[PDB]
């Protein structure tokens, strides 16, 4: 992996399912000027991952007030993401999303971020906080069974923005 | 940058630590096989973000004990510097008495093994690692220098890994 604290976060260009439900090719560099929370989850149509994704989506406004873009990603195809979004939450899907979901079918983004579980071809639960300069500020990687906290992620984003202010 | 990989044995180390009783002891990560371990790096002694974290982990050590989890802190400073900070009154910015050991990594090889050395400065980033009772690395956390870690979040992770170890 090439993700190093204090260095530019590895860029990517990938197809995402955008909040409007439609495909768009996006790049991490598209969000320079904003903080970014970039998180991986292992795969679509699973048990723990939708709880995390929906939590980040539901609370997207709290990141927007921090000028912070949230982006999720898995090695699934962009069609698989679309299927999951188009499946209602009450039927085990994601439902409508407030955040883009990146597809990493070549596994190169997960590799660049050091979160590929090589023996399965899927990502660990990696989460990365990138500042408005594109510099990586925080690395979080959970083994597959344990999910992430939106509260903790907001705490971190808020703290980096506060400490960015001292000069 | 490091040999710390999720699902692999956490890199072993043997290093001098200042123990809670205020004495120096050479300890190894492998000493704690059979228990979960929270192993965290902080950049330097006699600083001003690090003490909030260290004191919080020490103050709340009993919550980790109830999870059968050992907490270990570490920085590149000498163990003598660690003890000097422990022995500095809290009212003057010291750590005060500690409930957790503080490892000294003067060769920077432990930080390098865990992939958290800030190479242009010779100090560790704020790396935190959750290691299960079999020695396997389960969680990686690395913060840039200015931003501290949360004991609440660390407890949540340790307990959650332990729960999923028993039933998934
Ligand atoms: O002791 C600290 C930082 C203490 C501090 C003091 C006064 C502040 O005013 C302040 C902070 C916090 C901070 O991180 O400042 C640093 C350094 C700095 C301070 C003032 C400046 O003007 C400047 O330019 C640069 C930064 O931002 O780089 C942040 C803060 C954070 C939480 C709060 O609750 C709060 O109130 C304020 O503001 O850290 C070291 C680590 C370490 C090792 C080597 C480095 O070389 C190094 O940089 C850092 C550790 O703890 O081991």
Give the dihedral sign, CA A66/A29/B142/B86.
Answer: negative
For chain A, say whether B160 makes contact (Cβ under 8 Å): yes
Q: How far apart (Å, rounded) are the C-alpha atoms in residues A78 and A23?
A: 8
Q: Smallest Cα–Cα separation from B52: which of B89, B103, B94, B88?
A: B94
Considering the domain boundaries, does residue A59 fall inside one? Answer: yes
- Its domain, for residue A81, covers 7-167
What CATH number is attached to the domain comprising B111?
3.40.30.10
Round to whole Å and give the CA distance between A66 and B141: 22
Domain count, chain B: 1
CB atoms inside a 10 Å sphere around CB B120: 7
CA trace torsion A33, A35, A40, A45 (10° rounding): -90
Residue of B85, B95, B146 to mutate, ligand 1, most atoms within 8 A of C-beta? B146
Give the resolution value in Å: 1.8
Question: What is the helix (H) or strand (E) element at residue B74, kind and residue range?
Answer: strand B69-75
Contact: A138, B138; criterion CB under 8 Å:
no
- B6–A141 CB contact, under 8 Å: yes
In a domain, A121, yes or no: yes
Residue B27 Cα, gap to closest chain A Cα (Å) = 26
Tell me how far the alpha carbon of residue A39 lies from the centroid of ligand 1, in angstroms: 27
| Contact assessment for residue A156 and residue A128, using Cβ atoms and an 8 Å cutoff | no
Residues A163, B147: C-beta atoms closer than 8 Å: yes
B164 touches chain A (CB under 8 A): yes
In a domain, B30, yes or no: yes
What is d(CA B1, CA B105) in angstroms, rounded to the nearest whole number?
17
Which residues in chain B are contacts of A158 at CB distance < 8 A? none
- Residue of A167, A153, A83 whose CA lies nearest to B147: A153
Q: Chain A contacts of B143, Cβ < 8 Å? A: 5, 137-138, 156
Inside any domain, residue B111:
yes
- A2: in domain: no
Residues B112 and B76 sit within 8 Å (Cβ to Cβ): no
Phi and psi, residue B136, nearest 5°: -85, 135
Q: Which helix (H) or strand (E) holds A30?
A: none
Say whether A146 and B160 touch across the interface (CB within 8 A). yes
What is the number of the ligand 1 atom nearest to the C-alpha of B44? 52
């Amino acid at each position: 992996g090439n993700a190093k604290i204090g260095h530019p976060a590895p860029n990517f260009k990938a197809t995402a399912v955008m909040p409007d439900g439609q495909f768009k090719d996006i790049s991490l560099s598209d969000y320079k000027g904003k903080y970014v929370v970039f998180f991986f989850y292992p795969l679509d149509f699973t048990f723990v991952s939708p709880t995390e994704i929906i939590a980040f989506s539901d609370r997207a406004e709290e990141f927007k007030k921090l000028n912070c873009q949230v982006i999720g990603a898995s090695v699934d195809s962009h069609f698989s993401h679309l299927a999951w979004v188009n499946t209602p939450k009450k039927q085990g899907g994601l439902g409508p999303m407030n955040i883009p979901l990146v597809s990493d079918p070549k596994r190169t983004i997960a590799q660049d971020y050091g979160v590929l579980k090589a023996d399965e071809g899927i990502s660990f639960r990696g989460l990365f906080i990138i500042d408005d300069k594109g510099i990586l500020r925080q690395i979080t990687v959970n083994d597959l069974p344990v999910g992430r906290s939106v509260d903790e992620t907001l705490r971190l984003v808020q703290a980096f923005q506060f400490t960015d202010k001292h000069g």
